[PDB]
């Protein structure tokens, strides 16, 4: 019928144009993210950009703290970002409540994936236009990255990037794990993994950075933290002295 | 007084060798008045036998309830229902009424037709699979029966010897009781074919 | 919003009519031929499967024949998915009647109840109908053997001989010509196999593509033996009639 | 009815008896009070028998679900939390007294849950009606860091002392030993206290000793061919 | 359903020519165990109305909340709607009243007795009573709890009718309330030496005199008798 | 407000429900999967694919466990497969494991899932799941059994079948390859050989997901001393095993 | 119907056209004039008959003994809103022992319009109300729109030829503010105000409907031969 | 025809609905929020449309709980609904946790409520920009809330028709005082830049409203400016623009 794509219904090609369109709204902030696995840590960086000075820079964020061990990095519009953040925090509380231990990242990936599926099966839900990266350090699975997308599909990774120009970053990561011959960087301090990540980002995007142009989130064991600008500056200085 | 004790009624069940036996009395009365001496308490679904004791109205209600289900099972799986899964079924349906409970005792008696195994099971008011491979009793003279049965029983009986044992176990317990006695039926349940014998036993 | 996109499929046409019903009937003539012939001694239900492959298993298949109760079975033609729901609802109604009267349901009651259920979907709710047609074979003491057909509208009619699904009109003419007022179950079996042999879309009619069941007064003194045959018995009676 | 759960550095051993009573009557000489929440998380139940089995039923189903979701082996505390909730809601109209014991990728564990929604921890818990008699032995003979041989011993002897100082206890002694990193072993009938003496004469009776009033045949076998 | 668990003692009060005085003692009793000391049962709402709540501290917290909420609701709108659409004693009274009644009807009572003491925008006295039955009544002298018939006789001995109010001066009223706190502290088993006092005047508004001590007691003559006789 | 209670699925004028037609087209868009029923087991095999080669595929599954005797495998949409596996487990426990305390026969479960598909075809506010599932299992009364549930809500039993975009060719191959007596070993070799015609990419045990409903494993039981209960008849084969069978072709 | 249809849409102009359609309900309504001094509020409404055998249709609804509303536009909508207002006025008398303030009730009415403007399947009400009252803060005249806009004015009008009344009030504005304690004068000025908004529809003694509220006077409706003193 | 509902997407990342709401907001009057060191100063331009109005008898700035001022532009009735909703939520928090709601917490609440109106066909997204802020115990904060359900931190925010002028002037004010200014000193500045934002609007005459919530002068409660202070601010601006 004339409606195949104002509601979630297959096309004559056997398809969902609507969900496609969701994927075509993940590149509007044009933020890029890069996430790699250390040996005992997980590191993720994202861009920060403010179009005006009259914003306060602190509040502009894309790294959202969901659990105490799971960080969430969002690619796509910020309204949907906030709705997703709220969803996830609810589910985390509820897992702790019903099973007696904090939510694993894997379980959260899948819970959020199934909610996604439900938004693309009900004829009056609009799907989220956000790709979520879940970074964690598990004690049963180790440092892990799970990526879910508006489809409700998710997959694991050794490393991954997101954004409009994230192919460049894919090249970088590919060559890096080509030389290393192993699925994670062998580094025993989270600092140097931040450093490596920023190096690959400068190479990939072709542009140098500053403390106010970055945003860094680190998942160590049994915690998650974000660095402030002051600590990011120090990483940048130690890059030049490699 | 307590509902189960308003009729009386008892069920005894024994395993033998390659056979089982289940037996009941036929008295159904209201407290002092014995009303009917034609009321079967043993029913059968396929080739599971279900004996039921306790409160009168629950006997019949449970009976048709189970009918409804086992009919489903057959129309669906296109096989008769095995006594074991029927044991689980009894347990579940009892525990569904945990508040506003039922006042009954089911005794499940059957033979696996897949291995030829006698299988018996017991229940009381809310549920509680009562595991045995020796014998199960229920009713309001379960005491008298437990004593009788424990003394006489000898593992791995022959079918006809099983008949003798269960008959006597029932008769003497029933005339030591005031809420049982009017008549008795014994089912000797073989592997192929089921014999129903009513026993001559003293009225009152 | 939502009124925007509403299609309104339970409204009339200028005909006074319902397109969805017509379309369901159209889609059932894409489904298999199912045949019911009533003998004076029993009822033959003969259904032809829609799919057949030398890799298909047809030995656990009862895709067309279902027991609603151990007096009443059906032949199903149409959307299988919708039919499954109605089948279990039917069984539940049967057991309910048995529950409250402790006596087996007449064929009348069940056929009508299902018709009402179909009627509800066409009447209101904005839903599409369940696209199934049933041939009911049943025995009751009040009217004896009873043969019924009901359609997605929620209407039933009794018959002496009937065909549904593909080539309704052709098989009907055949049955006219070859019907006897009283028949045997053997004569009825013969007529059924023959009619499906002249209406089958593959040059040959085979046991592995036949579902075949009867309800017979072989069992005596007011007992009826249902039989859902094995394909290997269908084979033998297919050689009896000389098709193979 | 006595249940001991004894914790030691290499796992946990949980032991129980098999007499189930119905008041002064012994309902059953053999049942298994040891249930399976999961292959690696066994529990035993005391108190109302119906209420024990049915709840372990319910949550065993639920935890299996949960485990298949997380594609990960279950926890002890997962089960324990579910239980706590479910009981608290009827506000103690369900009388369950469970020892929940189990190993997992976090170690050995031993918890006890009451019939209200209370829970306690120890290296060393005892529940049921014979719990007192077990406890007595258990505190003189216990020490930290048992091996599995020692722990098995201690559990089983506490159970007998329960048999011999409690009337609701009696029967074979079943044990289940759950060790870290190994499949759980069910030592059923580990030690048999009390064998039934031999009847002084048989009580088989000749045929035809009882009367038959009439007889009939009915065949539930099938509905008929012809 | 609900019954007294943690309780305060008594609120006392009276009218005088230009306003009202209301006072309460600072005690949270847990039965015989005097478990909480320094607990204040006068709660100002507005700036010319003191609401003294007796009965349970438990329910008292959840009424304390609602007074503040009403202030918030009333302040919502133009700047003229908090200058002179402000809450009045007669408004506050009705609010507390209605909520208590409806909880009594549902059979889950708010177990308190409340005195609402203030002066109007019109320039009038307002001193009124409500309790856990829904009974309301006004009088020139009021108390709650055990002081309903311990302290109140004394206060009603000063001002017998409403036409002796313009004859009573604010300092005589002062004296009477102190005196009656002294009597309470004598002859009642749950009483605290600490009391809070508030004076609502229509010419200077609310002045809240906190943590007065009861002084000038008599114990001299309990050495001139001995035994039970 | 909401008024999506009218079906989005209707009859087409030419007789058919258009939406299942579109969904069945969507199934020929996905991965390829097949299942062979042997006399003494069943084998199910599928391809692992990911967006990127740097994505993990060991933390991802296309053969999922519904019960210790029953596995599923799909061709079609991933997201749709995921939720529906969970629902299958769900109704398997609430309506057979609370009512009979044990796991369902293969067939019973098949119908349980066909209803969910059916109510995705009925009842406005939904569209069909765009998957075909193979439900392979073993029950103790009809032995080994292999079913296919389609986007429509029907099922069919098969002796061997394939789903996905390479289905026409695969089925023609299995036409000769199937035999009246087949050994589970031989069926393993056969399934690999067929899905090799179907797969262009690198061929290892790390990309071919193999699972067997073969025979019971007392070692996967997780406990001992119970002879009455036996182990799962399902098993997922990890990569090591499958790497031998690459060489045994 | 491109963007014009539905109360859920935008409107590349930022608008919604349903609102303007509903303001046409004001335009096809008959004129009514409200004016207030600091001690009296007066509403002067032009009733209107259907024909000669028909009577005139009321235009002023008593809400309370100090509060009144007069409709302009569809009668059936006016009916929903008037009930609502009386409901909460009696509420405020009950719970707070207090007259319901005008300024406040405007806001309540605001939200009640907003939410039929929110949901699909609602509509904006097609009636605009003039609400006068006298409370502890004095006289008040509120103007209520189909948009849901409440405004406080010295004197205003709605209906057909509302402009010709506004100009009149623009000249005589500072006259009627200085007249206080003489309600008669305010009433005469309102009669003269609505004379400018006639279609040669002459003022009769049963076509004109007066209603007043004062410091010292409850809300009153004059009709019949009570209006002859001013005509 | 992807302009029809909010739950539709388009292959341009656009959801035309929500963009159109911004044009409703572009129709409102100037409204500024000045973030100062001590608190926040809001001001609204109140057009005097006719000589029949009662002046200073209509407020477009309404307070929520007592320490969060809220001033909105766009559709006045619609924004009115939004403020009502936010008061419900504020009182809920206050009952449940015994403290006046923090400003970031408030921000979460309102953002979620407006984000909600784009996920259902049943509702229309609100066409209002809100500016809300105040003093809590973790300091003064300022937020501007989009009809899109987006928001950020701000050192100065504006909306309306004379937003062009206002934004530029605020840029200057942060260049005059990069360490900030007093809320006392900001009264005069709000006057100034509203006056400057009325030359794009110089069809009419208007009345100036100013309100502020600062810790140093109102003790952290949201009060209005009046009297000699208000009129002095008026005169200040008046002399500047002549």
Domains and CATH numbers, chain A: 2-242 (3.60.20.10)
Write the class of the CATH domain G1-231.
alpha beta
Distances (CA, A) of G115 to C45, H13, H71, H85: 61, 29, 20, 12
Enumerate chain C positions whose Cβ falls within 8 A of a Cβ in G.
1-4
Q: How far apart are CA C140 and CA C135, in angstroms?
A: 16
Residue F169 CA from chain centroid, whole number: 19
E and H touch with 3+ CB pairs <8 Å, answer: yes
> In this complex, how many residue pairs, one in chain C and one in chain F, have their CB atoms less than 8 Å apart?
108
How many CB atoms lie under 10 A from the CB of residue E160? 10
Q: Which chains touch E (3 or more CB pairs under 8 A)?
A: G, H
Tokens of F132: 């075909």
Q: What is the number of residues in chain D?
A: 226
B and C touch with 3+ CB pairs <8 Å, answer: yes
D57 touching F (Cβ < 8 Å) = yes
Q: Is C102 left (phi over 0), alpha (psi -120 to 50) or beta?
A: left
C-beta atoms of H52 and G15 within 8 A: no
β-bridge pairing B184-189 and D124-128: unpaired
Architecture of domain E1-229 in this structure: 4-Layer Sandwich (3.60)
C-beta atoms of C2 and A7 within 8 A: no
| DSSP annotation string for chain F | ---TTS-S--B-TTSSBHHHHHHHHHHTTS--EEEEE-SS-EEEEEE---SSTTEESSS--SEEEEETTEEEEEEE-HHHHHHHHHHHHHHHHHHHTTTSSSPPPHHHHHHHHHHHHHHHHSSSS-----EEEEEEEEETTTEEEEEEE-TTS-EEEBSEEEESTTHHHHHHHHHHH--SS--HHHHHHHHHHHHHHH--S--STTTEEEEEE-S--TTSSSEES-SSS---SEEEE-HHHHHHHHHT-
C-beta atoms of C5 and A124 within 8 A: no
Tokens of E85: 């659409």
C-beta atoms of B128 and D53 within 8 A: yes
Instruction: Please give the angle made by the CA atoms of C83, C88 and C90, to the nearest 5 degrees.
Output: 90
CA neighbor of A221 nearest in space, from A95, A42, A73:
A42
The closest CB to that of H123, out of G15, G118, G147, belongs to G118
F224 touching A (Cβ < 8 Å) = no
A and G touch with 3+ CB pairs <8 Å, answer: no
Which residues 71-110 of E are in CB contact (within 8 Å) with H? 72, 75-79
End-to-end CA distance of chain F: 61
Question: Which chain H residues are Cβ-neighbours of E69 within 8 angstroms?
Answer: 91
Q: What residues of D act catalytically?
A: 1
Residues 6+ apart with CB under 8 A from A187: A38, A39, A193, A196
Range C7-16, long-range pairs (CB < 8 A, 24+ positions):
C7/A1, C7/F6, C7/F10, C8/C126, C8/F6, C9/C126, C9/C127, C9/C128, C9/F6, C9/F7, C9/F10, C10/C122, C10/C123, C10/C124, C10/C125, C10/C126, C10/C127
Which residues 116-155 of G are in CB contact (within 8 Å) with C? 120-121
Q: Where does residue D100 rank: exposed (0-12), middle (13-18), buried (19+ CB within 10 A)?
A: buried
Percent of residues in chain C assigned helix, strand, coil, to nearest 5: 35, 25, 40
Residue H7 CA from chain centroid, whole number: 28
Mutation for C interface: G2, G10, G120, most C CBs within 10 A? G120
All domains in chain C, ordered by first residue: 1-244 (3.60.20.10)
Q: How far apart are CA D192 and CA A45, in angstroms?
A: 66
The closest CB to that of E78, out of H57, H87, H226, belongs to H57
Tell me the nearest-neighbour CA distance from H175 into chain E, angstroms.
Answer: 35
Place of tokens 């799971």: A70
Tokens of D88: 């608290």
Distances (CA, A) of D107 to D9, D11, D69, D126, D180: 9, 8, 22, 21, 7
Sheet holding C34-38, edge to edge: C161-164, C34-38, C42-48, C210-216, C225-228
Q: Give the three-class secondary structure for C84.
A: helix
Residues forming a β-bridge with F144: F138
Q: Give the three-class secondary structure for D180.
A: coil
Question: Which chain H residues are Cβ-neighbours of E75 within 8 angstroms?
Answer: 63, 66
Q: Which chains touch C (3 or more CB pairs under 8 A)?
A: A, B, D, F, G, H
Backbone phi, then psi, for A160, in 5-degree steps?
-165, 160
Q: How far apart are CA A197 and CA A37, in angstroms?
A: 10
Tell me the nearest-neighbour CA distance from F140 into chain A, angstroms.
Answer: 34
- Give the count of domains, chain B: 1
Instruction: Please give the angle made by the CA atoms of A43, A48 and A52, to the nearest 5 degrees.
Output: 170
Question: Which chain H residues are Cβ-neighbours of F2 within 8 angstroms?
Answer: 120-122
Which residues 117-136 of A are in CB contact (within 8 Å) with C? 124
Q: Give the three-class secondary structure for E104.
A: helix
Question: Which chain F residues are Cβ-neighbours of A124 within 8 angstroms?
Answer: 2, 4, 125
Backbone phi, then psi, for E12, in 5-degree steps?
-130, 160
Question: Which chain F residues are Cβ-neighbours of D72 within 8 angstroms?
Answer: none
How many CB atoms lie under 10 A from the CB of residue F180? 6
Task: Find the helix or strand (DSSP H, E) in which C59 lies.
Answer: none
Report yes or no: H193 and H65 within 8 Å, Cβ to Cβ. no
Residues 6+ apart with CB under 8 A from A142: none
Report yes or no: E196 and E53 within 8 Å, Cβ to Cβ. no
Question: Which chain F residues are Cβ-neighbours of B121 within 8 angstroms?
Answer: none
- Give the count of domains, chain H: 1
Report yes or no: B111 and B117 within 8 Å, Cβ to Cβ. yes
Q: Which of E1, E136, E168, E204 is catalytic?
A: E1
Report yes or no: G187 and G210 within 8 Å, Cβ to Cβ. yes
Tokens of D42: 């066994």
DSSP annotation of C215: E
| DSSP annotation string for F176-236 | HH--SS--HHHHHHHHHHHHHHH--S--STTTEEEEEE-S--TTSSSEES-SSS---SEEE
Q: How far apart are CA B23 and CA B197, in angstroms?
A: 10
F122 touching A (Cβ < 8 Å) = no
β-bridge pairing B28-29 and D11-17: unpaired
Residues forming a β-bridge with D45: D98
Q: Which domain holds residue F88?
A: 1-248
Tokens of A61: 């964020």
Q: How far apart are CA A184 and CA A137, in angstroms?
A: 13
CA neighbor of G142 nearest in space, from G104, G96, G86:
G104
End-to-end CA distance of chain E: 46
Residues 6+ apart with CB under 8 A from G144: G106, G109, G128, G129, G130, G131, G150
Tokens of F97: 């494991």
Distances (CA, A) of A114 to A133, A148, F65, F72: 16, 10, 17, 18
Tell me the nearest-neighbour CA distance from E94 into chain G, angstroms.
Answer: 6
DSSP annotation of D23: T
Residues forming a β-bridge with A161: A34
Q: Give the three-class secondary structure for G207.
A: coil
Residue B105 CA from chain centroid, whole number: 8
- Give the count of domains, chain D: 1
CA neighbor of A140 nearest in space, from A110, A106, A95, A112:
A106
Tell me if residue E136 is catalytic.
no
Number of H helices, E strands in chain D: 4, 13
Report yes or no: E98 and E66 within 8 Å, Cβ to Cβ. no
Distances (CA, A) of F77 to A146, D5, F243: 19, 49, 28
Residues 6+ apart with CB under 8 A from G192: G168
Q: How far apart are CA G46 and CA G210, in angstroms?
A: 9
Q: Give the three-class secondary structure for C10.
A: coil
Tell me the nearest-neighbour CA distance from G125 into chain C, angstroms.
Answer: 21
Which residues 41-70 of E are in CB contact (within 8 Å) with H? 65, 69
DSSP annotation of G84: H
Report yes or no: F79 and A116 within 8 Å, Cβ to Cβ. yes
Q: Which of H29, H30, H159, H218 is catalytic?
A: H29
Q: Which domain holds residue H49?
A: 1-242
The closest CB to that of A79, out of H12, H115, H157, belongs to H115
C232 touching B (Cβ < 8 Å) = no
Backbone phi, then psi, for D55, in 5-degree steps?
-75, -40
Question: Which chain C residues are Cβ-neighbours of F111 within 8 angstroms?
Answer: 84
C-beta atoms of F171 and C82 within 8 A: no
CA neighbor of A196 nearest in space, from A166, A226, A173, A230:
A173
Report yes or no: E175 and E159 within 8 Å, Cβ to Cβ. no
Report yes or no: F25 and F153 within 8 Å, Cβ to Cβ. no
Tell me the nearest-neighbour CA distance from A155 into chain H, angstroms.
Answer: 24
- Give the count of domains, chain F: 1
Query: From which experimental method does this structure derive?
Result: cryo-EM
* Orientation of helix H76-97 relative to helix E57-75, angle to 10°: 160
| DSSP annotation string for G138-196 | EEEEEEE-SS--EEEBSEEEESTTHHHHHHHHHHSHHHHTS--S-HHHHHHHHHHHHHT
Q: How far apart are CA D51 and CA A155, in angstroms?
A: 43
Task: Find the helix or strand (DSSP H, E) in which C162 lies.
Answer: strand C161-164
Question: Which chain G residues are Cβ-neighbours of H77 within 8 angstroms?
Answer: 110, 113-114, 117, 147-149
């Amino acid at each position: 019928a004339g409606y195949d794509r104002h509601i979630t219904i297959f096309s004559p090609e056997g398809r969902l144009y609507q969900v496609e369109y969701a994927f075509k709204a993940t590149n509007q902030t044009n933020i890029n993210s890069l996430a790699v696995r250390g040996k005992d840590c997980t590191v993720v960086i994202s861009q920060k950009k403010v179009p005006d000075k009259l914003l306060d820079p602190t509040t502009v964020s894309y790294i959202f703290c969901i659990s105490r061990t799971i960080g969430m990095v969002v690619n796509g519009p910020i309204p949907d970002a906030r709705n997703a953040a709220l969803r996830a925090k609810a589910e985390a509380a509820e897992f702790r409540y019903k099973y007696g231990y904090d939510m694993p990242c894997d379980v959260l990936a899948k819970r959020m994936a199934n909610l996604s599926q439900i938004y693309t099966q009900r004829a009056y839900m609009r799907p989220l236009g956000v790709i979520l990266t879940f970074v964690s350090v598990d004690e049963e699975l180790g440092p892990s990255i799970y990526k879910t997308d508006p489809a409700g599909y998710y997959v694991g990774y050794k490393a991954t990037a997101t954004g409009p120009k994230q192919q460049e970053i894919t090249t970088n990561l590919e060559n890096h794990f080509k030389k290393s011959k192993i699925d994670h960087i062998n580094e025993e301090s989270w600092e140097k993994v931040v450093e490596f990540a920023i190096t690959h980002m400068i190479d990939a995007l072709g542009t140098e950075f500053s403390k106010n142009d970055l945003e860094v989130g680190v998942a160590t064991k049994d915690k998650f933290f974000t660095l402030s600008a002051e600590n990011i500056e120090e990483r940048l200085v130690a890059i030049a002295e490699q | 007084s307590d509902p189960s004790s308003i009729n009386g009624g008892i069920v005894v069940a024994m395993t033998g060798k390659d056979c089982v036996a289940i037996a009941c009395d036929l008295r159904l009365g209201s407290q002092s008045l014995g009303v009917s001496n034609k009321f079967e308490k043993i029913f059968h679904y396929g080739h599971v036998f279900l004996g039921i004791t306790g409160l009168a109205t629950d006997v019949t209600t449970l009976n048709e309830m189970f009918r409804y289900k086992t009919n489903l099972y057959k129309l669906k799986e296109e096989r008769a229902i095995e006594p074991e899964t029927f044991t689980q079924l009894v347990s579940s349906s009892l525990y569904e009424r945990r508040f506003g409970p039922y006042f009954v005792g089911p005794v499940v008696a059957g033979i696996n037709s897949k291995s030829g195994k006698p299988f018996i099971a017991g229940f009381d008011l809310i549920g509680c699979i009562d595991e045995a491979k020796d014998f199960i009793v229920s009713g309001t003279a379960s005491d008298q029966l437990f004593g009788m049965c424990e003394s006489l029983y000898e593992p791995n009986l022959e079918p006809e010897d099983l008949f003798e044992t269960i008959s006597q176990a029932l008769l003497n317990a029933a005339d030591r009781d005031a809420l049982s006695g009017w008549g008795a039926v014994v089912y000797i349940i073989k592997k192929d074919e089921v014999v129903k014998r009513y026993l001559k036993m003293r009225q009152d | 919003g939502s009124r925007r996109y509403d299609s309104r499929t339970t409204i009339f046409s200028p005909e006074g009519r319902l397109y969805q019903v017509e379309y369901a009937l159209e889609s059932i003539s894409h489904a298999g031929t199912a045949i019911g012939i009533m003998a004076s001694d029993g009822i033959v239900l003969a259904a032809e499967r829609k799919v057949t492959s030398t890799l298909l298993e047809q030995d656990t298949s009862t895709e067309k024949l279902y027991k609603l109760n151990d007096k009443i079975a059906v032949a199903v033609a149409g959307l299988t998915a919708d039919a499954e729901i109605l089948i279990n609802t039917a069984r539940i109604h049967a057991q309910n009647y048995l529950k409250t009267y402790n006596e087996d349901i007449p064929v009348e009651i069940l056929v009508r109840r299902l018709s009402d259920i179909k009627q509800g979907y066409t009447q209101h709710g904005g839903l599409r109908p369940f696209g199934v047609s049933f041939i009911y074979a049943g025995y009751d003491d009040r009217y004896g053997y009873q043969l019924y057909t009901s359609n997605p509208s929620g209407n039933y009619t009794g018959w002496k001989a009937i065909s549904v699904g593909a080539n309704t009109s052709a098989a009907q003419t055949l049955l006219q010509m070859d019907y006897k007022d009283d028949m045997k179950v053997d004569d009825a079996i013969e007529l059924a196999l023959k009619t499906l042999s002249k209406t089958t879309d593959s040059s040959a009619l085979t046991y592995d593509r036949l579902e075949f069941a009867t309800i017979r007064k072989g069992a005596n003194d007011g007992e009826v033996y249902q039989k859902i045959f094995k394909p290997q018995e269908i084979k033998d009676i297919l050689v009896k009639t000389g098709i193979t | 009815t006595t249940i001991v759960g004894v914790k030691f550095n290499n796992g946990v051993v949980i032991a129980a008896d098999t007499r189930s009573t119905q008041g002064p009557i012994v309902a059953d000489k053999n049942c298994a009070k040891l249930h399976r929440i999961s292959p690696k998380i066994w529990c035993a139940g005391a108190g109302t028998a119906a209420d024990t089995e049915a709840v372990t039923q319910l949550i065993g189903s639920n935890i299996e679900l949960h485990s298949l979701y997380t594609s990960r082996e279950p926890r002890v505390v997962s089960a324990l939390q579910m239980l706590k909730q479910h009981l608290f809601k009827y506000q103690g109209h369900i009388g369950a007294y469970l020892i929940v014991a189990g190993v997992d990728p976090t170690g050995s564990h031993l918890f006890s849950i009451h019939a209200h929604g209370s829970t306690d921890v120890g290296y060393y818990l005892s529940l049921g009606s014979g719990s007192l008699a077990a406890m007595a032995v258990l505190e003189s003979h216990w020490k930290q860091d048992l091996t599995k041989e020692e722990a098995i011993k201690l559990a089983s002897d506490a159970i007998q002392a329960g048999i011999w100082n409690d009337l609701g206890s009696g029967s074979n002694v079943d044990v289940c030993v759950m060790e870290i990193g190994k499949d759980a072993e069910y030592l059923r009938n580990y030690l048999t206290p009390n064998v039934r003496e031999e009847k002084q004469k048989s009580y088989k009776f000749p045929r035809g000793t009882t009367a038959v009033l009439k007889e009939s045949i009915v065949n539930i076998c099938d509905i008929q061919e012809e | 359903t609900q019954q007294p668990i943690v309780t305060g003692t008594s609120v006392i009060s009276m009218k005088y020519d230009n306003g009202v005085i209301i006072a309460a003692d600072n005690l949270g009793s847990y039965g015989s165990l005097l478990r909480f000391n320094g607990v204040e049962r006068l709660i100002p709402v507005g700036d010319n109305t003191v609401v003294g709540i007796s009965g349970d501290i438990s329910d008292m917290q959840h009424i304390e909340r609602l007074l503040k909420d009403l202030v918030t609701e009333n302040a919502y709108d133009n700047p003229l709607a908090d200058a002179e659409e402000a809450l009045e004693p007669s408004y506050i009274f009705e609010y507390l009243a209605t909520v208590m009644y409806q909880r009594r009807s549902k059979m889950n009572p708010l177990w308190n007795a409340i005195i609402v003491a203030g002066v109007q925008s019109n320039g009038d006295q307002f001193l009124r009573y409500v309790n856990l039955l829904g009974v309301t009544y006004s009088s020139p002298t009021l108390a709650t709890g055990f002081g309903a018939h311990m302290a109140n006789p004394l206060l009603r001995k000063v001002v017998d009718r409403e036409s002796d109010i313009p004859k009573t001066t604010v300092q005589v009223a002062e004296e009477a309330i102190v005196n009656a706190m002294r009597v309470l502290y004598y002859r009642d088993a749950r009483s605290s030496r600490n009391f809070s006092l508030a004076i609502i005047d229509k010419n200077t508004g609310l002045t809240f005199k906190k943590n007065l001590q009861v002084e000038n007691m008599k114990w001299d003559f309990a050495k001139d008798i001995k035994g039970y006789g | 407000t909401d008024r999506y209670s009218f079906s989005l699925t209707t009859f087409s004028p030419s007789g058919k429900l258009g939406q299942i037609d579109y969904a069945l087209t969507a199934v020929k868009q996905g991965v390829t999967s097949l299942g062979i029923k042997a006399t003494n087991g069943v084998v199910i095999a599928t391809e692992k694919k990911s967006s990127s080669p740097l994505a993990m595929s060991e933390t991802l599954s296309k053969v999922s466990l519904l019960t210790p005797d029953i596995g599923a495998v799909y061709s079609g949409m991933g997201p749709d497969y995921r939720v529906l596996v969970d629902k299958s487990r769900k109704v398997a426990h609430t309506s057979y494991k609370r009512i009979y305390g044990e796991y369902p026969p293969t067939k019973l479960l098949v119908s349980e899932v066909a209803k969910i598909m059916q109510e995705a075809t009925q009842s406005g506010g939904v569209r069909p799941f765009g998957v075909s599932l193979l439900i392979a299992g073993h029950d103790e009364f009809n032995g080994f059994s292999l079913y296919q549930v389609d986007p429509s809500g029907s099922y069919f039993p098969w002796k061997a079948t394939a789903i996905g975009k390479g289905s026409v060719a695969a089925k023609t191959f299995l036409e000769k390859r199937w035999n009246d007596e087949l050994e589970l070993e031989d069926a393993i070799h056969i399934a690999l050989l067929t899905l090799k015609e179907s797969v262009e990419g690198e061929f290892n045990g790390d990309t071919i997901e193999l699972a067997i409903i073969g025979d019971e494993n007392p070692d996967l039981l997780g406990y001992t001393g119970i002879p009455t209960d036996k182990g799962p008849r399902f098993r997922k084969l990890t990569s090591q095993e499958i790497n031998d069978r690459l060489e045994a072709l | 119907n491109n963007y014009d249809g539905d109360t859920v849409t935008f409107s590349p102009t930022g608008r919604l056209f349903q609102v303007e359609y509903a303001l046409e309900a004001i335009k096809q309504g008959s004129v009514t004039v409200g004016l207030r001094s600091n001690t009296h509020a007066v509403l002067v409404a032009l009733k209107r008959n259907a024909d000669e055998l028909s009577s005139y249709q009321k235009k002023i609804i008593k809400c309370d003994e100090h509060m009144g509303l007069s409709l302009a536009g569809l009668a059936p909508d006016a009916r929903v809103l008037s009930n609502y207002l009386r409901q909460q006025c009696n509420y405020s008398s009950l719970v707070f022992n207090r007259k319901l303030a005008v300024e406040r009730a405007g806001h309540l009415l605001c939200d009640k319009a907003q939410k039929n403007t929110q949901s699909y399947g609602g509509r904006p009400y097609g009636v605009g109300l003039l609400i006068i009252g006298y409370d502890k803060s004095g006289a008040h005249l509120l103007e209520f729109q189909p948009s849901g806009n409440v405004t406080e004015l010295y004197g205003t009008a709605i209906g057909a030829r509302s402009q010709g009344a506004k100009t009149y009030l623009e000249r005589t504005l500072d006259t009627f503010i200085k007249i206080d304690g003489n309600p008669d004068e305010l009433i005469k000025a309102g009669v003269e105000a609505i004379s400018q908004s006639l279609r040669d529809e002459s003022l009769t003694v049963d076509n004109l409907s007066i209603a007043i509220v004062g410091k010292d006077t409850p809300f009153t409706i004059y009709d019949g031969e009570a209006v002859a003193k001013y005509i | 025809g992807y302009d029809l509902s909010n739950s539709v997407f388009s292959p341009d990342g656009r959801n035309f609905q929500v963009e159109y709401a911004v044009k409703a907001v572009e129709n409102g009057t100037t409204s500024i929020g000045i973030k100062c060191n001590d608190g926040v100063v809001f001001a609204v331009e109140k057009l005097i449309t006719s000589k029949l109005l009662v002046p200073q008898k209509n407020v477009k700035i309404q307070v929520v709980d007592r320490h969060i001022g809220c001033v909105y532009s766009g559709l006045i009735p619609d924004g009115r609904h939004l403020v009502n909703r936010g008061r419900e939520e504020a009182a809920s928090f206050k009952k449940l946790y015994k403290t006046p709601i923090p400003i970031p917490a408030f921000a979460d609440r309102l953002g979620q409520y407006v984000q909600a109106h784009t996920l259902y066909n049943s509702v229309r997204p609100f066409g209002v920009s809100t500016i809300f802020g105040g003093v809590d115990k973790n300091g003064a904060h300022l937020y501007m809330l989009e009809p899109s359900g987006s928001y950020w931190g701000y050192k100065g925010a504006a909306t309306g028709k004379g937003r062009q002028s206002a934004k530029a002037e605020l840029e200057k004010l942060v260049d005059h005082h990069p360490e900030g200014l007093s809320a006392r000193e900001a009264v005069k500045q709000a006057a100034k830049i509203i006056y400057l934002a009325h030359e794009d609007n110089k069809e009419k005459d208007f009345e100036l409203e100013i309100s502020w919530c600062s810790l140093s002068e109102t003790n952290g409660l949201h009060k209005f400016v009046k009297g000699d202070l208000l009129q002095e601010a008026i005169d200040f601006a008046q002399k500047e623009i002549n």
